[PDB]
Amino acid sequence: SHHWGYGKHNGPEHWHKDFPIAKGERQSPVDIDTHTAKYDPSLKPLSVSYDQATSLRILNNGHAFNVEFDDSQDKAVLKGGPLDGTYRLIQFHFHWGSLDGQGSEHTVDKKKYAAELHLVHWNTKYGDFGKAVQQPDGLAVLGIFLKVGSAKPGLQKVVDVLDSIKTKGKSADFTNFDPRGLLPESLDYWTYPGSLTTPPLLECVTWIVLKEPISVSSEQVLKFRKLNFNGEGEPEELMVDNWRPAQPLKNRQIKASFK
Amino acid sequence: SHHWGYGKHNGPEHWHKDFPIAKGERQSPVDIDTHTAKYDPSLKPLSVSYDQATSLRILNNGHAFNVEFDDSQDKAVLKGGPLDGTYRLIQFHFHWGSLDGQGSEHTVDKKKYAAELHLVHWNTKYGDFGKAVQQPDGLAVLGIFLKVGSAKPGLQKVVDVLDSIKTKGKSADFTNFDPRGLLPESLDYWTYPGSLTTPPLLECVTWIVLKEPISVSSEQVLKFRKLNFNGEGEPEELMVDNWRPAQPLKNRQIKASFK
Ligand code: NA
Ligand SMILES: [Zn+2]
Ligand SMILES: [Zn+2]
């Protein structure tokens, strides 16, 4: 089948072959230069309403692991900030490194974090995720850096189930997970127009990247590295370095909600 | 689950529900008003090079039947006219009516023909059809009107095989078919920027519609009406009136190659 990954032959440098938008004008991630990002005090506070979030399952898709939510109603939504309308949470996933010193997709003054959490939301005025991804204003991804440090209690339920989804295609029931437990205390953010960071690389994302990282323990992130990109009974290829490097900003402006 | 067709409930008037681009700026087909479509002397001579065309198979896809070609090399190409680049023939198909007085998608001064032949080509530079459909210059469709009259010898080979592809999903081998035999003597044409005339209605088509129809006998076109939209063992729904009506021109200009 058509496929892609993060290896020498199928990795980010080659994605352009099947997905020519890889060289587009609004690609993600980007490096955030804190001295040139533009303060915009017209940006509203972000409203994160996750009180009724309903997680369903966790799965290994061969590129990362997703925790999927019931997005049939407004149970977990993002509003405000730079957004117009209501964006419903569909899933979250991470990108991470082979070493603590790398793994994030966005960087801040070229600094890489150990991992990056993406909470993926779609604009309810398009009716479903499939329609939303084909629109410039279809998705809002909230990106949250993970810095190695203190353990994050809220991540532990995720870590504890990874052994049941080791290889590509494995899934497991994953109910009653509270995504509020992955948020930092400050909701100060950068924002810019961009894309999905994996194929098909669609330019449909309003990026909202939080200034404040969450901590996770060296042991928590190590558990991510023990997942496999490959399927069961295939040669073991550890799921590490599933990040796209920073792409050119081109004519875009990154805005900060804070000075 | 998603379905479209040509019935009262799933037909062209409802396509916009799942495919909002149905109400876009460059939709097809259109009515060609011969009093306002003007000669454009910047148009280049149209080159149809089909001497090495290699047909492979014929199939009923539940919406029409397609004759598919080997598009791995430049064996059957369209160049010149309004096009920049070389466009490879991938398939042809028709749209037709329940009666001889209707069936074309394009109309000329509001006149409908009994059917319309679409020769579908994609721009080599995009590597394959799938990539090409996502670009405004991806496809070139040569459209040829079928007027009921004398039998067309060049169509007979197609007619003769239809009893082997009666239902959706059936296919048959269809080698050595010469698509030059479906062309009229004049390559005078009208051209405008438009779309696929079926879902997903992507706005990736340079239309080239020939002035001169080819003749089809009443019996030849009758055979098209004995095909079935449905699969084998499903209720019989005869494959007729699989045409989209003319859409608004909006801000486009239709150019003529001839004075
Ligand atoms: Na007219
Ligand atoms: Zn991501
Ligand atoms: Zn057609």
A58 Cα distance to chain centroid: 15
Resolution attained, angstroms: 1.7
Q: What is the DSSP letter of B259?
A: -
Whether B136 and chain A come into contact, CB under 8 Å, resolves to no
Mention every residue, 6+ apart, whose C-beta is less than 8 A from residue A201. Answer: A15, A19, A21, A22, A24, A27, A195
Domain span holding position A114: 3-259
Could you give the CA distance from residue A238 to residue A160 in angstroms, rounded to a whole number?
A: 18
Could you give the CA distance from residue B190 to residue A62 in angstroms, rounded to a whole number?
A: 49
Is the CB of residue B180 less than 8 Å from the CB of residue B52? no
Q: Nearest to residue A226, comparing CAs of A60, A113, A92, A107? A: A60
Tell me the one-letter amino acid at A222: L
The two structure tokens encoding residue B121: 């080509």
Task: Indicate which CATH number applies to the domain containing B41.
Answer: 3.10.200.10
Pick A20's closest partner by Cβ from B18, B20, B131. Answer: B131
Distance B19 CA to ligand 1 centre (A): 27
Q: What is the DSSP letter of A244?
A: P
Which of helix, strand or coil describes residue A118?
strand
Could you give the CA distance from residue B133 to residue B203 in angstroms, rounded to a whole number?
A: 8
Asked if omega into B20 is within 30° of 0 (cis), the reply is no
Could you give the CA distance from residue A217 to residue A226 in angstroms, rounded to a whole number?
A: 15
Is the CB of residue B128 less than 8 Å from the CB of residue B139? no
> Which chain A residues are Cβ-neighbours of B126 within 8 angstroms?
20
Whether A18 and chain B come into contact, CB under 8 Å, resolves to yes
Whether B63 sits among the annotated catalytic residues: the reply is yes
Residue A18 to residue B126, Cβ atoms within 8 A: no
The two structure tokens encoding residue B123: 């721009």
Could you give the CA distance from residue B159 to residue B224 in angstroms, rounded to a whole number?
A: 7
Is the CB of residue B135 less than 8 Å from the CB of residue B125? no
List strand residue ranges (DSSP E) for chain B, in order. 31-32, 38-39, 46-49, 55-60, 65-69, 77-80, 87-96, 107-108, 115-123, 139-148, 171-173, 189-194, 205-210, 214-216, 255-256
Which of helix, strand or coil describes residue B254?
coil
> What Å distances lie between residue A101 and A94, A110, A112, A237, A241, CA to CA?
16, 12, 6, 20, 11
Total number of domains in chain A: 1
Is the CB of residue A179 less than 8 Å from the CB of residue A56? no
> DSSP labels for A37-104?
SEE-TTSPPEEEE-TT--EEEEEE-SSSEEEEE--SSSSSEEEETT--S-EEEEEEEEEE-SSTT---
Is the CB of residue B95 less than 8 Å from the CB of residue B118? yes
Q: Nearest to residue B137, comparing CAs of B152, B148, B122? A: B122
Could you give the CA distance from residue B95 to residue B102 in angstroms, rounded to a whole number?
A: 10
Distance B158 CA to ligand 3 centre (A): 16
